[PDB]
Amino acid sequence: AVVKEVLEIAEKIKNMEIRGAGKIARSAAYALQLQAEKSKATNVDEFWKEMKQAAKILFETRPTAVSLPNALRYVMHRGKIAYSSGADLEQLRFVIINAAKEFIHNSEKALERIGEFGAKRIEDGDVIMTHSHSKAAISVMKTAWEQGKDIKVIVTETRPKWQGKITAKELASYGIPVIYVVDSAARHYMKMTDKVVMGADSITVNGAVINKIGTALIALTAKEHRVWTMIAAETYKFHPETMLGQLVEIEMRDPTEVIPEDELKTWPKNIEVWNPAFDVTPPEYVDVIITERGIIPPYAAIDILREEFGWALKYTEPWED
Amino acid sequence: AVVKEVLEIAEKIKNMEIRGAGKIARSAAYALQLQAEKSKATNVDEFWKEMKQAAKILFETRPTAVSLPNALRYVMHRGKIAYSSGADLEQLRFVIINAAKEFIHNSEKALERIGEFGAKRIEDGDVIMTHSHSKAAISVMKTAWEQGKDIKVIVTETRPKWQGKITAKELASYGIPVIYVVDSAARHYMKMTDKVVMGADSITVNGAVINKIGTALIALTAKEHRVWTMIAAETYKFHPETMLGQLVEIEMRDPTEVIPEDELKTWPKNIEVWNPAFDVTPPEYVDVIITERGIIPPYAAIDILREEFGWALKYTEPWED
Amino acid sequence: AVVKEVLEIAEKIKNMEIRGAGKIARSAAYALQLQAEKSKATNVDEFWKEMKQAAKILFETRPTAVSLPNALRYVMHRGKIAYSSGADLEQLRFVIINAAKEFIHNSEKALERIGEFGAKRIEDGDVIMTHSHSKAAISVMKTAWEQGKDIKVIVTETRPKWQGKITAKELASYGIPVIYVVDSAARHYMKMTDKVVMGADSITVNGAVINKIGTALIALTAKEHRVWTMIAAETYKFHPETMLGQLVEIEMRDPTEVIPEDELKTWPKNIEVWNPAFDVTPPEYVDVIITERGIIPPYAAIDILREEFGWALKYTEPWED
Amino acid sequence: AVVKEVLEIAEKIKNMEIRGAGKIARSAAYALQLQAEKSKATNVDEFWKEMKQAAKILFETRPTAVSLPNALRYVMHRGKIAYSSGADLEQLRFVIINAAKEFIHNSEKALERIGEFGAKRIEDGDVIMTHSHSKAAISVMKTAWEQGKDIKVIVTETRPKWQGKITAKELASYGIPVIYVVDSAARHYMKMTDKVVMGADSITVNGAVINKIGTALIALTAKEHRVWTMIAAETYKFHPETMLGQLVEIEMRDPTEVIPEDELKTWPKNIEVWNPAFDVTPPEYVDVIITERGIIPPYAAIDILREEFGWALKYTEPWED
Amino acid sequence: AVVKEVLEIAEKIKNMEIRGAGKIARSAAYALQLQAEKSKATNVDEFWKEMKQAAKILFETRPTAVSLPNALRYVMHRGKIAYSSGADLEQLRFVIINAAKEFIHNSEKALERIGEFGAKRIEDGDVIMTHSHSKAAISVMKTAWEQGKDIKVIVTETRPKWQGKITAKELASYGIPVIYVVDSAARHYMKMTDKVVMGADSITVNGAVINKIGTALIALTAKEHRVWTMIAAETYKFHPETMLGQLVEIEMRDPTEVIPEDELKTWPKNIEVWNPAFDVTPPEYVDVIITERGIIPPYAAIDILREEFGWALKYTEPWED
Amino acid sequence: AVVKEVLEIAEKIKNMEIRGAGKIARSAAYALQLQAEKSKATNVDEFWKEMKQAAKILFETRPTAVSLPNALRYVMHRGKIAYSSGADLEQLRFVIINAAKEFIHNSEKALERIGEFGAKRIEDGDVIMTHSHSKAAISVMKTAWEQGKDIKVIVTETRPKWQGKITAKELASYGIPVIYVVDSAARHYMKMTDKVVMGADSITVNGAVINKIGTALIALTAKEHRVWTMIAAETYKFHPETMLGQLVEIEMRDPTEVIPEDELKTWPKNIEVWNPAFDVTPPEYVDVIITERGIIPPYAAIDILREEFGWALKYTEPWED
Numbered sequence A, B, C, D, E, F: 001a002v003v004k005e006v007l008e009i010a011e012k013i014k015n016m017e018i019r020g021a022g023k024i025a026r027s028a029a030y031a032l033q034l035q036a037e038k039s040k041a042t043n044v045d046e047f048w049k050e051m052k053q054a055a056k057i058l059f060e061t062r063p064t065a066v067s068l069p070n071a072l073r074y075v076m077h078r079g080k081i082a083y084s085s086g087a088d089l090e091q092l093r094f095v096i097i098n099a100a101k102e103f104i105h106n107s108e109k110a111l112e113r114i115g116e117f118g119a120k121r122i123e124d125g126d127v128i129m130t131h132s133h134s135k136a137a138i139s140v141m142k143t144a145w146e147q148g149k150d151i152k153v154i155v156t157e158t159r160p161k162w163q164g165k166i167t168a169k170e171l172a173s174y175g176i177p178v179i180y181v182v183d184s185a186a187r188h189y190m191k192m193t194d195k196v197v198m199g200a201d202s203i204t205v206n207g208a209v210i211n212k213i214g215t216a217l218i219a220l221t222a223k224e225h226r227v228w229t230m231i232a233a234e235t236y237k238f239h240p241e242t243m244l245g246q247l248v249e250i251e252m253r254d255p256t257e258v259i260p261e262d263e264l265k266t267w268p269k270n271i272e273v274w275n276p277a278f279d280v281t282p283p284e285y286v287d288v289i290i291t292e293r294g295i296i297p298p299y300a301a302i303d304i305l306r307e308e309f310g311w312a313l314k315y316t317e318p319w320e321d
């Protein structure tokens, strides 16, 4: 029943042709949007049927980043309230297309505000170390530079997908001086790092931060040197389920993403490659979290969950049936 | 004025076609041996003049690993003694060809011992994490595997030169099961690690270990989980000058080992690739150093030095002048 | 003036014939019920007298666990609200038997949900270590095991009262495999422990956990090996006066509980036996607290306090004239 | 255009003839009150124009302590409300003279409460170490002394302004025994210290304490010995802008407060005296903050902010324009 | 072939009728004496047989404390030196009864001097906490008290064998005031402890201390509150094979020592009792070791090893054919 | 019997008119020298009598720095050997005058060598933080600068004697840029410090360093930031007695050295000033010790004691009788 452009967004999400917790969330919301502008269902209850089907597909692309499930919870939720009210086919159609834009928009805005708030923590002459490719982190960095602050960013490689290359090339485009190094070099240059700025895919109620593999290692050595570790993440990066005791699943991706298939098939079969895409960073190695609602201590993650998600506790996923 | 096989061996030490602190030291010894065998100098003074130019060449290949200079000192020091003692042309030649053989032979026996001694610390059912590629480290693991001890080794990729592919392929051939992960997975799988066994290129009098880049990071999180970190290294890995306040220098290799020339030239001028080949591990993160002389705590490195190189302090390099 | 039952439930609390913060709080609530239930007051102003009397009697049984003065407050606070409004004799006898019914019921509920939230934190294969005997702790593990999760619990003896035996047997009844070990062995077996789950008798606003003696020791070594420490406690375990700066009193039980008097008489005058009933575990050694309201970081204890005990603070204990 | 007693009070805040975050805030409030009482403006707009110039003067005395701007915001914010509400000349005057009195009066009551609450944490026989001179800190100690609690206070010299001589002379007058030592003795006598009680000038949303220079050092070694570090500070010591990512600036006072002009001029040009008046204490070294609203963990500072200054974020300074 | 006495001293070691590393080592030496003393061998090659037999019998009593195979080595090593030289029947019977006399004597001496050196570390007024029952520990405290130093010792019960009772009583005999507390209370009373003195059963080359179960826990919390941890041990407590990489075996005593079989039979099949007799205390938790050769940092254990056991290593246990 | 110039050196030592562990040691040796050049005793046994009397006087000037007792042990010892041989009056007279010079000379030399060895650890562009006034530390610093290295030194004030002023003015004379700050500022500027270099008065066998008050605090925060702490101290700064369990006494000086008498007599008598002149820094906060015999890990302090003082163990002070 699901349109084709929806199956495409979903595929590009599990192949990481489209990646990054914030972008995936928007693309998810943009999937639903397209499903509503291109739906053929002639009846409303059937339209609502397709949406729930398109939502389940999106949800199942990649597990770890809650941004995806949250974006789904935003659009699908309003769509549900509208449905259980008496939304006529063309009415729900708009409510969804609307709620879809609304989200894709507050995301764009949330990044600017995270940029403004975190950029005040960056001091002139500061050297920043980061990991992976985070729009949020980059926002904090890019904004600081534009305020006239003189910085230099140490970009870690970020294997196995070489995400450091995106950060390096992007950051260099804004004019900012970059220093690219291998992951293992993180503790070697930590002594000359002033601040550490990274993003997040999911943040647990107790302050734990799940981010691209290797983040935990960087935060560990960062604490050891007394360097700040600021995580730049929107409020939709926080995991509501987490507060119910729910454990956030660390996605395991395909091995040929680490060692190319044509080279891997050459290897002795008693050698096995494990490719975890994220890891967990303890709240004590995190000094602050920069959200579009202010700087907050890790442990204050429970406050964000209560005020923005007093919804998820009561029901199932607005796309279940 | 020196033999071709000497300049070509020197060359491989620089291109790293020949690597590993131990193998480089032994290759160094072997070069002096070839220079003594193929030398066509009809006069002893001329000959000795030829040995010093070959030792001066080998010495200036790569700086970090003391194993190299110590192998040179071992051979050259005996040569000086004899030469000063008015040695014949053939006599001196003999002294050198025997000092080389002797070193190379002891180096190999040292690997065997470090193996037995280290292996007694690996218990049946142990999951061992390693880094880079170390003949010494592998000895400990191969030996344990051959006493019937069922173990599993987690091999970290070790960028930028993919040294982990070496260790994995090698350890596998002995049957040992291998788990291959990216360096950034170090802390993620550190909770399921029982023993950490790594090698070294140079060890300071205070017990500081200079090993492949990323070693210190693994060691950092290892202490964090109360997992023993054991460094398998021969006595000639200890740095004698260190005791005179000299710092070990960290080799900075070409940027194109991280990012290939083809693609690097593509990057904007404001991006810089830094490539340290080693890092330092404080002595408190090192539980024990396994040497052919037996196990010792990091802080005892001074005892090893005062013993072996008790005169490698004032006597200027025996290949100087 | 008080009924017989009240006086003896108070006595069974004082000698631990009935123990365990939770069970103690209900026993106390039940007691107040029996007073209002079996009373013979022939006036109301008199009834409310022999209520503040039986409340204050119970309050003075043991001091560490707030669960007791908290349950007490819950029933009395409703009686006082009623009474001071013009409660008829029989109106009040109902208000009370009711409030006592709900707390007892609510308590039984709370354990169910804590069990459910906590179990989601226990992964299949996990070796859990516990201490003392706590219904909240047991509930989390018991729930996990019935979910299909194959676990194995290390139970610590917990002297002087051998409370560990009450835990081992019970967990054993449920078919859960157990490893019984002496308190002292906590650090020796922490290396093989995955999670540590323990109850609580009182939790402070800053998140400090007051639990059976020896708890802070286990928490300490767990942080050392980076093993999650999860305290399971109902909201009525949180101390409200702890916010106005009060300190939790640590009960000092009779020495003959450690050394049987038959023997203690044999001992010299200069040997003194001190029997702390509990100890204090800092918030930094507690990763999360499992309540019937969800999982929270130890520093969010203030949220639970403000939320459940906002009223209590400005008023005096309702059982005080 | 503003009153003399305003410029002279502003002056003392700069010469530190009037110091202490609390006293400065109250003196600030008092100045606005005098400006309202002595103002001779016959027109309201003129009057309001006069109040803003006096608030702009007071604000630019010393930067670090937010108490000052918060006292200004308290008075000025009410003034703006009324003024915008078309207040009379006498009406506005009235609004201001009452906002000042009100603040000054609450500040004093806040000191009393912080006293009772903090004192409950000091036990009989306690040896308390302090730093600098804090009315808030002293309240906690004077109160404990007056509940019969026999205590001893170790007063640290607190250079460069010898603020410790103040605390010592003051605490002594209440009878309390005092041990006076140099700041550098902090760790030496820290082993015999039971409680650390210090004040503060500003507290960040993450619970970072900005207090007199040397505070962080004492706090560092305090954690090292497992000695509680308690910061006694009023709610208006918490920094609202902090939540928007703004860093608190550390005032750099004249070099001649460290080394006198007479002797300083003697020193060679290549010597520089740096004089930070404050330093930062991470939130993990702070056990609890004692406020008039009760005790709270460092990480809860955000709750205090969201409460008190819930609108002190967007509303530009009420004395701007 | 062995005498009766030897077999029963071995039996009393196996059931701890005789325990305590030191006492065990002498009992073992005495035994060898009784063998050579009460033997009836009518040949020498036969004598030396029934010596290696009674030595190997004793060696196989308990494994943790090296003091046993160390005492054994001391007597046998002298016999073997003699014998293999051409020892007459009676010559050897003397060599032995002699070597056994000296070790026993030397041991008694060693405690005296350890007591003397250690007491100089105990200041008047000091509250010392101890664990288990150790003659070396008791000697240091007993000496201190007789020097005039007014001390007060906190004795930990030390389950499962209640060994603390043996300590409390003894220290009490000497007039030393004692505070008896349950193992679990270690952290609760560490705040009032000045020094911690405990014995040892084996000490490794890197300085790790193997002592009664629960020792590593006390050491851990002591470092936490920065309280000196002093291990008192004679040179024969240091493990020599620990240098060739061997690991100290931790004895696993019978479960009925924790739970009386009368009861243990009542317990379900899925409850298993594990009884570790010792645990391992890392060198970083040991500040100093008191030996009859002076005070040394835990990392100097290698000095003591090389100095007293240089010979032993290249040879096989002298009691092995 | 003692000459007058001896009573003067001694007085200038207890009034610190002459201070610094290294200088005091030399002045002590120079006292004995003068006592020998100006002695009137006509007989040798009487001369030897006066020397022992002059030595006891010197020994009793100031307690903490072993440099004093060691210098005494050097001159007085040779003088004793000479005496018990048959030294004639004019012979012992020279032996002493000789041994006196010898020491005063090797001290001057030992400082140069400490300068050379430690200066190799200082890197160009490095910022050095120090404490008090240490010739040894200054040697390491001054030498580095002269080797052309670009440094900047952060000189802490060092109360109560304002010793920082000597370091500042001296270091500025060599041309080196200095930054003078109060003690409390130590943790504030530790973030921008690259190396920490301080001297020592006494070093215990286990690596503990006793130095000017406040040193321990600086080392603590130095460890916390991962900055090196190098202690520059001659081998005569090591405490031999220490190895015998001996505790090094922390001198307590007169209060009017902290607060001028004319101002102190004004103070309330229930205020008491404590003036400890040194404190103890743990071996774990010390990375290396630079001695005239090489760089050594703290824990290697026992090696220095054995090789340079195998004398003190056997006898009393060479000036007792």
Ligand SMILES: O=P(O)(O)OC[C@H]1O[C@H](OP(=O)(O)O)[C@H](O)[C@@H]1O
Pocket: A019, A020, A021, A022, A023, A131, A132, A133, A134, A135, A136, A137, A198, A199, A200, A201, A211, A212, A213, A277
């Ligand atoms: O949402 P933004 O801020 O862009 O990036 C947030 C995080 O999500 C990404 O995960 P992945 O690359 O999608 O697997 C990275 O780990 C990144 O740090």
Ligand SMILES: O=P(O)(O)OC[C@H]1O[C@H](OP(=O)(O)O)[C@H](O)[C@@H]1O
Pocket: B019, B020, B021, B022, B023, B024, B131, B132, B133, B134, B135, B136, B137, B198, B199, B200, B201, B211, B212, B213, B232, B277
């Ligand atoms: O000597 P073995 O034990 O073989 O290995 C010693 C160390 O030398 C190597 O450096 P590189 O690869 O030569 O640059 C690796 O870092 C390895 O750990």
Ligand SMILES: O=P(O)(O)OC[C@H]1O[C@H](OP(=O)(O)O)[C@H](O)[C@@H]1O
Pocket: C019, C020, C021, C022, C023, C024, C131, C132, C133, C134, C135, C136, C137, C198, C199, C200, C201, C211, C212, C213, C277
């Ligand atoms: O409420 P539940 O979870 O049942 O027990 C909570 C705590 O109360 C008990 O104290 P005590 O035995 O009453 O002295 C134990 O310490 C236990 O951990």
Ligand SMILES: O=P(O)(O)OC[C@H]1O[C@H](OP(=O)(O)O)[C@H](O)[C@@H]1O
Pocket: D019, D020, D021, D022, D023, D024, D131, D132, D133, D134, D135, D136, D137, D198, D199, D200, D201, D211, D212, D213, D232, D277
């Ligand atoms: O407000 P109260 O509690 O009195 O003291 C608060 C803090 O303000 C002072 O700074 P300054 O002396 O004004 O520069 C001190 O640092 C003191 O700790």
Ligand SMILES: O=P(O)(O)OC[C@H]1O[C@H](OP(=O)(O)O)[C@H](O)[C@@H]1O
Pocket: E019, E020, E021, E022, E023, E024, E131, E132, E133, E134, E135, E136, E137, E198, E199, E200, E201, E211, E212, E213, E277
């Ligand atoms: O040699 P001494 O100091 O007497 O005792 C040393 C150690 O030996 C004992 O073990 P066990 O009781 O034999 O199992 C105790 O653990 C004690 O600490």
Ligand SMILES: O=P(O)(O)OC[C@H]1O[C@H](OP(=O)(O)O)[C@H](O)[C@@H]1O
Pocket: F019, F020, F021, F022, F023, F131, F132, F133, F134, F135, F136, F137, F198, F199, F200, F201, F211, F212, F213, F277
């Ligand atoms: O011997 P040098 O290196 O000069 O200084 C060594 C140490 O001795 C001094 O003590 P004091 O000033 O004499 O009390 C200082 O504490 C200094 O750090």
Ligand SMILES: [Cl-]
Pocket: A159, A160, A161, A277
């Ligand atoms: Cl990835």
Ligand SMILES: [Cl-]
Pocket: B017, B018, B019, B020, B023
């Ligand atoms: Cl190779």
Ligand SMILES: [Cl-]
Pocket: C159, C160, C161, C277
């Ligand atoms: Cl109990």
Ligand SMILES: [Cl-]
Pocket: D017, D018, D019, D020, D023
């Ligand atoms: Cl003032």
Ligand SMILES: [Cl-]
Pocket: E159, E160, E161, E277
């Ligand atoms: Cl036992």
Ligand SMILES: [Cl-]
Pocket: F159, F160, F161, F277
């Ligand atoms: Cl001084």
Ligand SMILES: [Mg+2]
Pocket: A191, A192, A193, F191, F192, F193
């Ligand atoms: Mg830095």
Ligand SMILES: [Mg+2]
Pocket: A300, A303, C300, C303, D300, D303
């Ligand atoms: Mg909160």
Ligand SMILES: [Mg+2]
Pocket: B300, B303, E300, E303, F300, F303
């Ligand atoms: Mg040594």
